[PDB]
């Protein structure tokens, strides 16, 4: 039976772009507002895995910052220990790979990014080898469409953002999220405009972008609640578990977190403190094995799953849809309009998002692969 | 895309102030539990449109027609037409049928289990893969086995039945605390100085103790090296079990009588076990794996129960256990497993203190023709 | 010295998107993924002593009733025959023990104990010439306040009209199901509270399918209209969720209809997760019902029994047990079940002017009519 | 149906200097003791002439108890149906609860009335009390030897020996009586009686948690059955700490009055065994405590004390109906002399109580007894 023969990693850089916030000599800028670094152009790391019989699997992970660090991990360590393995042992292979370095504490960050790209490609292969979509190897397909929500409203002013939203509503979308930092007029007002414009039927959530104390977050949420708030995301710092638990206990709005996590181990202490109502796994950080472990833990603990979505060619997005098709508790899924649209030329397969819903790809494996054009754009490590 | 077409249920009977009654049931004065005089289980045969067949099995010791009725009157119709690659999702749908009325354990889940195992059996045949390869990977093809019990009337006779099993490769054992007529310290003391400081020896305490009673028995065993202590208190006595777990340095093991991962949650939350012992015949592959995944997340070891059966749910257990990270050992019913080799075709085996995980597609085992002829339809 | 002689089990059937029943009469409501028969059906048990005294029990028979009758006929019956009905609670414990170590501690198994248990108490009452409640510590009341269990109409307004009609007949306590509140629970509470006035009590049955935070939000939206209790806010196994809801809302949380034994209650109470317990006699039997009522008493929890489809036998047992409990406030009443089934019983169990009349005679004070017995289908 | 017609109450007397009233204080435990044993009895008669008997403590100021019965409770009981016995208990408890009369003499007084009404109930139905409590589970009840009233360790060991030879295999000694330390006491008794018997210790309250834990750790090597009353009744924190700090079972309850007393202790996991005293509690409370124990997998080992035998009879009936009854205390010193005061088959021999067989309590005061009653 077929075994992994070779593994290659590449970056894929895209022409889509991100006062005193100019990129540095390496193409990185920092937003003074949040002290977070951003690259100038979209970019992700892809991994190509081929078996002895010539089957090919594709995986993908973040590559926004120092992507050659991730590729070095794949190339220097993981590749040589994955060659020879059976892709049907994907989750066990994942655990083996994770154990290589766990006792030295490389149990997140770049290390799990690397693991994810490999994990996704092995699962892609398993599906192809068996002639099944990945969700049929994950316990079954529960749905073939997944509701999508508009990830944000990147406009200059409140008025404009609200119109942008109404445009999307016209296309069949009835769930939306805005980021609190962009709310120049304040969250209460943003919420007011959106509710007014869009009506009482739509769901409206707010991503608070982490930088608040528990008390600051509570005040902001309370100010939004009168206008019908779907959920509040990332109200406090990642490390501030006590803060997160206080916030969830203090407001009646569902609290959502998780996009910056890496493994199910990250979820456990937040559930222990009943600090979240919704988990938001980002497939590109986690890989299928962990993303499923988080979704299953959410099932046991009665937490809703609303996966994150981000900059990427569509490979880990495809994995996110497959895994999401197989999870009991997946309600809805983030949708990045300005990323999904332009990236269409990069993919072959029938993945789509239209009329407020994702279409889960149907072919074996992920159901999608990089187009000939995409494969030409790839730059090998 | 192949689909479930028909489902049939059967019983299969195997011969082994407490006389059996009209219907062959007796009650041990010792533990107030009911027993059949004849061992019996419930099998399920599932066939798809294209003619693939899957087999499942659950308990049938008592009122097995009740379980077959659940299967035949309710579950069958909601399974027929489904894709067996959706086994887990099908499990959740069937469980939801009756959950709001509180049918979330006992006979209802026994019924779900037999169907679940059959469906997974089909998924593997259709993919031409062992079930463990549909459960995230095969992590082992052998699973260490421990000797379930030593049924003899004397502390000395028991110490022998054991030594013999030891002479056959086995190096882990368990004894039942009620069987120890001389006291459990005697039992431990003897077994230890008769099998060496090598083997692992555990005690199944059979539920009937208060926390403080159980702590006393355990401390009297601990000097002799106690591998684990199973079922030290009543199933309902979660506080009791938490107190026991915290008061002794011995691993506490529970789980054979549960049905779903939901049963495990409250016990993990009280740090009330170090080992979970799922019984596949009660749970099915879907629940078994969920319990094993939960154990993995919570750093709990997995030592699956084994029991009276044809070998169908046992084969399921072995497949699930090959795919679990935290499976250390697996119980071995020597008295049962032994004479049932004539009921199965496939390469499932146990020797030299280890189970061999069956290799074929699906569970890797099926009832022989001779076994199917013994089946009594519902 | 009269002992149990024989035991028989029967069913009793009664008329009433892609949800068409299948060839076995079962449909699944897409909304809640739950199965329903297209026909009321319960399981009855008839127990007779050496001396010819007869007692009746009843329990759920909505789905696979044969399974429950099989547990009674194959297992439980032989171990009851020969025993003294005045040992009903002792007997229940013995039968529970037969299978407890294998985990048959709820579901169909306890349904089976319940029918047997109720018939035995019926007998002990008949044999003593006393109402069941005079064997349960004493009668404390002979009338039990009743509340309207549901409002089966398809608009908010038609549902308010329905409640007002019941108000006209002397009812002053009501409950609606959140899944039917097409306008939302807030709007539902508003029209009910406006149509019926400031004095009526209005509860919401939330029907399990919510996360704790979804539940808290729904409840907060209802509270400004004076919410009596919120029932089944989250999944049964979601005890963490249940505790968090109770701790986050000022409204009384009610649970219990789907439990089986007092053991089910302990962990919820230990988490302070309920203000009201709602035992269902048809699932529990009198022994378990009363142990739950007494646990409630010690823990200052109100008891508001559930009511459901049935012949009226387990209902009667519910009224007897209720008449003996300190903490019984009111009792659920389903007209739709109750009125039709009047033909099926001899005795004085009634419900009018917002109150259950507790049956007078010995035992349960009721028994199936000739007509009913003529409809029984033996297992 | 028959109804309560009248109620009367009486004392019955039986046989560090006592004061002019019969009371002495033991420097040891600061507790007061009468010189003559004494209890309070109540006699209840129906319209139709049925008669029930009940009893409670009368050791100290028995007139206070009888006064509560006579002045308050009697008039609110006359007219009620005895089959409502438990409902009547709650009604009576409620007369005074808001003023905080929820234990002590008040509940003593309720207990005597409760016991009499249950008697009437059984009699009226022609049933032993246990058949009105949900069934009889047993007719014999393992008994254990309450104490070893000897001035020397060697002598006590022997007295236990005599008892072992008459069929008893469970024993308890009081830690204060142990002149050479509780460790030496356990050791000798364990050697004299072998490794089979159960030996418990009643520590008589007067210890801090840490004192108690040290004493118990000293005893444990010698096979300790349970430790009773290790700290003050009000010291629930201390009780919890004791239970959590030793592996031995902790036993309490003899001085409680109601099931509400038990809840706070169970909540702190502070006990493995409850020791209800029928004389303080009555059948209603006794049974409620017994059921609460059942739910929480706690053992029930009822206490026994100086008495006529009426509340002892109630205790056996109740215990015959309890699921969790392990054994029952045995006061040989009281029980044997007192036999002449009772009519019925209540017995204790070969290490077992025989539960009375007749209807109601199955026992009633002898003609000699009734002659000796002093009315209130
Ligand atoms: Cl890193
Ligand atoms: Cl069941
Ligand atoms: Cl007082
Ligand atoms: Mg975010
Ligand atoms: Mg076991
Ligand atoms: Mg309800
Ligand atoms: Mg004492």
Automatic annotation (TrEMBL), chain D:
Keywords from the UniProt entry: Lyase, Metal-binding, Plasmid
Pfam families per the UniProt record, alphabetical: MR_MLE_C (PF13378), MR_MLE_N (PF02746)
UniProt domain Mandelate racemase/muconate lactonizing enzyme C-terminal: residue ranges: 153-249
Transmembrane segments: none
GO molecular function, one term: lyase activity
UniProt cross-references to PANTHER family, sorted A to Z: D-GALACTONATE DEHYDRATASE, D-GALACTONATE DEHYDRATASE-RELATED
Protein name: Enolase
Organism: Rhizobium meliloti (strain 1021)
